[PDB]
Design a protein around this motif. Structure first.
Motif, short mmCIF file in Angstrom:
data_model
loop_
_atom_site.label_atom_id
_atom_site.label_comp_id
_atom_site.label_asym_id
_atom_site.label_seq_id
_atom_site.Cartn_x
_atom_site.Cartn_y
_atom_site.Cartn_z
N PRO A 109 9.30 69.23 66.33
CA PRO A 109 10.30 69.33 66.84
C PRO A 109 11.32 68.20 67.06
O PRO A 109 12.26 68.01 66.84
N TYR A 110 10.38 67.07 67.19
CA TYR A 110 11.03 65.69 67.38
C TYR A 110 11.88 65.31 66.03
O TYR A 110 12.90 64.81 66.34
N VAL A 111 11.28 65.68 64.77
CA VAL A 111 11.87 65.19 63.59
C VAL A 111 13.05 66.17 63.55
O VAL A 111 14.23 65.75 63.17
N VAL A 166 2.78 54.96 62.03
CA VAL A 166 2.54 56.20 61.72
C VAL A 166 3.23 57.29 62.49
O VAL A 166 2.28 57.99 63.22
N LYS A 167 4.24 57.07 62.77
CA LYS A 167 4.88 58.15 64.01
C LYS A 167 6.17 58.85 63.39
O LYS A 167 7.02 58.01 62.71
N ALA A 168 6.13 60.18 63.58
CA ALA A 168 7.28 60.81 62.94
C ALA A 168 8.16 61.52 64.26
O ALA A 168 7.45 61.87 65.15
N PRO A 169 9.49 61.21 64.30
CA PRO A 169 10.41 61.08 63.15
C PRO A 169 10.30 59.40 63.24
O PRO A 169 10.41 58.75 64.00
N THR A 170 10.52 58.87 61.79
CA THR A 170 10.91 57.40 61.63
C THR A 170 12.23 57.37 61.01
O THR A 170 12.41 58.18 60.31
N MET A 194 11.74 54.35 65.73
CA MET A 194 10.59 55.28 66.18
C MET A 194 10.97 55.84 67.58
O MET A 194 11.87 55.56 68.18
N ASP A 195 10.60 57.15 67.96
CA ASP A 195 10.79 58.11 69.11
C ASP A 195 12.02 58.60 69.01
O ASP A 195 13.39 57.95 68.92
N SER A 196 11.89 59.77 68.88
CA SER A 196 13.51 60.51 68.84
C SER A 196 14.57 60.53 69.82
O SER A 196 15.76 60.25 69.15
N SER A 197 14.30 60.02 71.07
CA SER A 197 15.39 59.78 71.99
C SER A 197 16.00 58.42 71.58
O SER A 197 17.03 58.27 71.50
CL LIG Z 1 9.33 61.43 68.72
#
Ligand SMILES: [Cl-]
Ligand SMILES: [Cl-]
Ligand SMILES: [Cl-]
Lengths: 204, 205
Positions: free
Chosen positions: A11-13, A48-52, A62-65
């Motif tokens: 959902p974040y991506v 290694v965090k999605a989304p990037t 990184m971090d969708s917000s």
């Molecule tokens: Cl995120």
């Protein structure tokens, strides 16, 4: 040459992808999983965090917000997916927060059930997160009943996030709900999924 | 008036508290746990997430980044903790992201260790998060080595978030670090902890 790294089934991506398109910002989408393609992902972002998000100059975010904050800045005031007026912006931040909470709890349930043996599942944890999940949608349902979201074909961040969250929860933790629950939330989400921008950004 | 709900030993609650003070916004603090006082918290915010901000009108907000967004708007452009120019704001967002990532992984290790019986802890999961945690601070270290953060008495969101993260990691997941690791990160955090706003907002009482 903006680049979004991650799978749209997150959902974040997905919220970043739909925000990018709603903002009118062109980008390249690289569907890489943080699980099945760990090294390729790490080679782009070692955390290694999605989304990037890889910016034009190569800066990795990184971090969708935080990514969306950047994109909002890149797009300018007129294109914003957020209200600028304080009271309306407050309502928007609450809706987004509840939606993100729903995403967080949904992902926690998924991780508990899929990244460890059944023997290691902890009932109390699943119970706690499941209740929080129910609470997040219940709060959203109440907010939507008080002031429905517009269905003029346009979208704001709360609308994008809520719809992405709902669809994700129904795809991965459907067992946590009874068919008729959160009618307003489900209703907006299913309306949103039929919008061009959602149809062009499938979760799977 | 403004109320912050949550214990300061949480990096997410602390970054909001220091941000509130840094923006010059008065507020009341209710140090409430999400565990032993679960029901009390649920009566304030049924989703039971800390930090929770109760606005002067009674509206309930969660997620530290969203709360801080509301606060920046409430404070006015004159008081922002973020740079507005694209290059500078981009760097700030990258720094805040890495710090939040460190917080996330640190909290994941804590939860895996503290919220479940020893028999239910999964080594591969801990190994994964541990690696991500080391990666996050590694990136921050390279960033700070390349371009040091200013040490002039005032703070930005990157400084607040980075320092709050480092101290939390040292307080709850110390076994993950050796004395020589991440000198630049450790250095700024240790500098930041001695600033008035950090001293007035301790992680523990
Ligand atoms: Cl995120
Ligand atoms: Cl609605
Ligand atoms: Cl948070």
């Amino acid at each position: 040459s903006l680049k979004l790294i991650g799978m749209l089934d997150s959902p974040y991506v997905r919220r970043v992808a739909i925000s990018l398109k709603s903002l009118g910002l062109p980008f390249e989408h690289h569907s890489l999983s943080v699980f099945s393609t760990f090294e390729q992902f790490k080679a782009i972002n070692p955390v290694v965090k999605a989304p990037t998000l890889v910016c034009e100059g190569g800066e990795v975010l990184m971090d969708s917000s935080l990514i969306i904050d950047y994109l909002e800045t890149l797009a300018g005031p007129q294109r914003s997916l957020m209200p600028t007026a304080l009271p309306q912006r407050l309502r928007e931040l609450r809706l987004v927060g509840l939606a993100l909470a729903a995403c967080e709890k949904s992902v926690q349930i998924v991780y508990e059930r899929n990244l460890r043996p059944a023997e290691k599942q902890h009932g109390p944890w699943l119970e706690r997160v499941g209740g929080q999940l129910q609470a997040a949608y219940g709060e959203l349902e109440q907010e939507l009943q008080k002031q429905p979201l517009p269905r003029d074909g346009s979208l704001g961040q709360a609308g994008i996030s809520l719809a992405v969250a709902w669809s994700f929860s129904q795809m991965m933790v459907a067992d946590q709900f009874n068919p008729g629950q959160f009618p307003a939330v489900r209703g907006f989400a299913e309306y949103a999924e039929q919008l061009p921008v959602f149809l062009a950004t499938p979760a799977t």
